[PDB]
Amino acid sequence: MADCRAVCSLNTSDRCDFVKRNPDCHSEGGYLDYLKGIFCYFPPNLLPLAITLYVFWLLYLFLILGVTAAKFFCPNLSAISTSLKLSHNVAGVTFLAFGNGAPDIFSALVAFSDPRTAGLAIGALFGAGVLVTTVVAGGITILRPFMAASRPFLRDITFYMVAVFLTFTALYLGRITLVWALGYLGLYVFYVVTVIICTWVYQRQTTGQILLQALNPLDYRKWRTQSISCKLLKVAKLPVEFLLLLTVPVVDPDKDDRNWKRPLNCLQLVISPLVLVLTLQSGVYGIYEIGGLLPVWAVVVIVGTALASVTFFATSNSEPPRLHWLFAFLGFLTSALWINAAATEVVNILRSLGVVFRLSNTVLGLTLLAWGNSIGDAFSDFTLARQGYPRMAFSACFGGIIFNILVGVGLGCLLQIVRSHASEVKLEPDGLLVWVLASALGLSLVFSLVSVPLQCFQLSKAYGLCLLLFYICFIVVVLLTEFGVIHL
Amino acid sequence: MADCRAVCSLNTSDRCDFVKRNPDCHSEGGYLDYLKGIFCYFPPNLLPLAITLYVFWLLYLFLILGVTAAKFFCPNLSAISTSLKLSHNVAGVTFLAFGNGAPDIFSALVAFSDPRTAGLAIGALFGAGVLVTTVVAGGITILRPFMAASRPFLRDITFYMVAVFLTFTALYLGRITLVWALGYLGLYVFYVVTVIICTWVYQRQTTGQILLQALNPLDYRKWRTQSISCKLLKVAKLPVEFLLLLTVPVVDPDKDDRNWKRPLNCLQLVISPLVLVLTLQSGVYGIYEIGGLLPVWAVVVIVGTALASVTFFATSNSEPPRLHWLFAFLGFLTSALWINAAATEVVNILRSLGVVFRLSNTVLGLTLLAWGNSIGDAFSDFTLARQGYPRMAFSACFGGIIFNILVGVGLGCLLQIVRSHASEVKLEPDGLLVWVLASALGLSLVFSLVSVPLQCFQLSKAYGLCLLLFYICFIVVVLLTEFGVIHL
Amino acid sequence: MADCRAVCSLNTSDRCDFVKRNPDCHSEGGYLDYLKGIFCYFPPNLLPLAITLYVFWLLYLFLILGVTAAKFFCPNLSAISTSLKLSHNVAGVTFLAFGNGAPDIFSALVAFSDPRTAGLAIGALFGAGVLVTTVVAGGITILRPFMAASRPFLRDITFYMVAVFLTFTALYLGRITLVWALGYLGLYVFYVVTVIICTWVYQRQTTGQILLQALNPLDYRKWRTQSISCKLLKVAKLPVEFLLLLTVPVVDPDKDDRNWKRPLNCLQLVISPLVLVLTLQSGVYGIYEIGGLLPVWAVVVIVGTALASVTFFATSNSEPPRLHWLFAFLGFLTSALWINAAATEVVNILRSLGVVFRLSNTVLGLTLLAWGNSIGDAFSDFTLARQGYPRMAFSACFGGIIFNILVGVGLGCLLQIVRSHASEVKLEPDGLLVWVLASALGLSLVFSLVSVPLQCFQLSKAYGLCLLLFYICFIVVVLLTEFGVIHL
Ligand SMILES: [Ca+2]
Ligand SMILES: [Ca+2]
Ligand SMILES: [Ca+2]
């Protein structure tokens, strides 16, 4: 079996045959075969343009990963928590971190699902830790100087340092066991409990019109008021939320009617199970045929329409049903699944590029995937800082990364152990570069660990500028390392 | 052919003969020779004494560049900017850019004269670009904080990035054809036209006693009150001040009199064109005879005295001429030349003393030459920033260099193509240093483009300090590469 | 001679005897043999406990250095500066310089005693210079912005650059002769004379109750109003404060009584020479017997008792004697030792821990030596900056390092020539690390010499942040070189 990477070394007349014949050049998950499109569907003379197109497509995927994370997933989780009566301070501390880090967890899980992309997963995590800590955080200090809380900052930086050192020693060991993932999850739950306890101690011391309006994502007044760039962003974004409202239910506890749309939701009780079945595991469960006569999707649709009719005739348009909260549960699950699908696509695209340009997995993980996953963090944090809440944004800038690393690594490793029935996940370090990446992350923390206390916790513009220059130097070192300029 | 450095290894009796017989030991800068003075006129026992005189001489040039920029160049540029109602951005983009780039265009053209020198032609350009965009910009920001104009800054940086990318692609391809040269020229013309159009759109939206007192640069009352050191400094500055006042007109718009000094101005109307003629390219045109009967300087004198007589008959003593502002242009142009020669002499100092020192070739064709080319830009920009025009200097910091890159590459390649009768000019990459320079320039541009908008266009001192640190890192990288300790 | 690290691989029975006979396992300058304690006094099963106990001891040491500098060293230095009417620059250049530089010189002499360690000594000197000139200066500027004096700063930086370049060329030649050492000493003498002359030119242009109250470190009024945790902190600080009060006299010009406690000062007049003699070279001079009949300690006790009795009978309790400021000198000198010894202990702990963790000596030999050797400076400079004298500490950050380099190198070389009866001392360059350290020192000096004057001598936080980033880059380069990432 010849390796996929040799494809660029063969004649153009045999590229299609080699791609079609090599099991390695086939991806186990996804809807599109990108390598086939690169080497068979398009002529070789148009090879560069196609790659550019892919990049554009890749960017669009990340946009989806933003919207589903911000407008449907996070509000559904917030409604679920409000059903459990959680405090506002805990919400401000955590929910933004969950909303910003869900794409990171799903991308890491998809990457760890296959050994060949395993090196991508770590490259997705540490690189993000290098970015959000250096650029985004620094950006906040540039936009609005403020005074940072001492004790929460020290706690967050200590927990992040502990997590980073644990992952460093795990990488040095070259393997991840089941007990290690369980310890990661236990450490995260310990951190959450510690945050709760410390906060407590500190505090103590016609139907057609409603469907047309609900399915309309264009607020005409706001769209008219916005500038040209915002108009372009909104028009580019319209199909994504159109599909999302169409398929994903959202429950908002802040609304007196709880976003009750009786016929829209009655249609959704049929739509959501169908998309769930047809999308789970790339639809493999969808075409499974029961007893050799009836496919699953047909009986799923029948049960869904029966339930929708029962609910529609059993409820009224004025008063939401007593079981309205269960909708959010559905509005949770499918939403997460949607993100998963998008995540898978992104990973596949990156792998394809690794075949074409003969690039290492770590370089792709720390450059493209990190930026794509952190664009949502950057937008949310900059918006929060500009609106007059820099303390919350800066606190989240360190709170979310710990949750990202711990939950992503632990859950991905746990699911890989459970699914493959293997006792261990093998981490193969892709040469020297990975070590450099880890080193960079640690150094950044050290800078903060010295810079913030030395300023008496009054963060200024120079701190952000220095962090930005540090990130530029880090990218300089990475670029030198990749192209083989420095080599043992 | 023996290297000129071998002068040091030869016997003291044969050094002068070797210098005389070897054309390579002749000054590339030209004008006053220095090596002949060191090795022929001065005995070796007097050579250490001789050495003291040149260092002192060197410092004197740094005084001249200090005076000409302080009293003649910058006030004339300010008068030109005020007279035409130009904004600071456009004036820095065109006039200060031409004045700063004349030595660089000349050096780039003469270097691009041959196929072997072609690799080096690009490296000096990139080094000068990096130095100007980093150190001069940082100094301007540190000395005087200011608010930059968003749209002109974005336009300038975008055009600079496009030009740098085009030059990088040209280097990667390894050849420059006719189409590339005409494309460079057309791009520069398009940039100038776009600047003009945007500016217009924004806008729409006894006599002998007088001569004697004018020719005196010394004020007796202030001289008496000055300290002994200050008196000595004034005495040292007196000769160059007198010569500049005799040679270079200055028009100060804010004073009502606008420096209208009639007899001195009539004298300048005839001496300044003579200075231009006998200074351009070391007087080659000055020695030229038209048909062997009338020399060029004679015709220049005739035209100058005709104009002087016309002004004498058509102008009065106490009322300014309505076309006085045009005189400023002349005072600008000569002043630029008064800079260039001085700068050249500085180089002719460093290069000469170095042969006795035995400085390495690899480091010089890249450090001394770029610094010598950009010393005029540094002096002019710092003097302008100190006086209270930071915006013009900051805009010129990009305008001069975009002009330099575009017009230098295009005009030099086109002239070489025409003279050599070739279809293309081959480009050789002389090691990793050119690629390092290009990467450094690109990364500096990226850092500026990210940092400046993030600061809400308020350029503080932290930005300048970070730029200085970035230049230190760049010099670290280039010094590491030159020694070969970082091998490909 | 087996490595001391092999103590880990041996059986628990013979580890103590291995520590006993192996000379490399014993520390020459410490009071306590930590390795002997861990491997002999404590059973192996309690080995982790000892480690954590040492950690606690380490922390307690950081408390002593916290108190001695805060209450005894800095007030005495301020009293000396005020009494002699010395400007902050001069006092920081001289007195704080010797106080911070004594342990360097001692370590440099010890290292230069063995010719094989000459390169290690010069590398340690360069590393200490880099650390003090970068990190200490940055922290000093961040903690308290100030306006530095122009002429003293320029003079100090020029002298330091000259010294660094002279050491560089001496290292490049590979030998240091007697003439070089005499030149170093003469240069230091010239520097001191120049400082003094320039300063002159500028200037011209019952007893029992009082003993109990004085020796009581507890203020009951502040004792009652304080919190439980700070009560524990005060209880912990009580013994060292009592010992320091008994040993170190304090003169405070800001108090009406000038901190005059006649019986306590009379007793200190006896105690201070006693403790000085008993700590100098661990009491070797104390055990010395003059002619085999009278020991030195008895003689100094008799002299101190006579002087104390004379002073007691010659002064009253109400008024302090005119020579009271002389006491400050004593209160200065002893305090310095009480810092130095403490610093030594910290090192003798860390090295021991390095034996347990098998840390590679590669990094420790130059870097770890510098941090333990400079910790006293760092403490003194930060404490002085916090109390309101940033200029003195900032000037010390250059004057003291000049003192270290010049005097250490000159005295070590001169002593080696005199002792060994040779004519030169041969310096072997041990790899690229020494060159990297020297180049980093030169680059930091150049960056400071460029940035500070451009800043108009107004030192703000951006300068310190940039210096810290520079140090992080320097440690990055050092780590890259030591690991063999870059091959020559
Ligand atoms: Ca993210
Ligand atoms: Ca120039
Ligand atoms: Ca020291």
Curated annotation (Swiss-Prot), chains A, B, C:
Transmembrane segments: 47-67, 92-112, 120-140, 157-177, 179-198, 232-252, 267-287, 290-310, 323-343, 352-372, 398-418, 432-452, 466-486
Cytoplasmic side: 68-91, 141-156, 288-289, 344-351, 419-431
Location(s) in or outside the cell: Mitochondrion inner membrane
Keywords assigned by UniProt, alphabetized: Antiport, Calcium, Calcium transport, Glycoprotein, Ion transport, Lithium, Membrane, Mitochondrion, Mitochondrion inner membrane, Phosphoprotein, Sensory transduction, Signal, Sodium, Sodium transport, Transmembrane, Transmembrane helix, Transport
One Gene Ontology biological process: calcium export from the mitochondrion
Tissue: Widely expressed. Present at higher level in pancreas, stomach, skeletal muscle and skin (at protein level). Ubiquitously expressed.
GO MF annotation list: calcium:sodium antiporter activity; calcium:sodium antiporter activity involved in regulation of cardiac muscle cell membrane potential; identical protein binding; protein homodimerization activity
Disulfide bonds: none
Annotated function: Mitochondrial sodium/calcium antiporter that mediates sodium-dependent calcium efflux from mitochondrion, by mediating the exchange of 3 sodium ions per 1 calcium ion. Plays a central role in mitochondrial calcium homeostasis by mediating mitochondrial calcium extrusion: calcium efflux is essential for mitochondrial function and cell survival, notably in cardiomyocytes.
Protein name (database record): Mitochondrial sodium/calcium exchanger protein
Organism: Rattus norvegicus (Rat)
Taxonomic lineage: Eukaryota, Metazoa, Chordata, Craniata, Vertebrata
UniProt gene name: Slc8b1
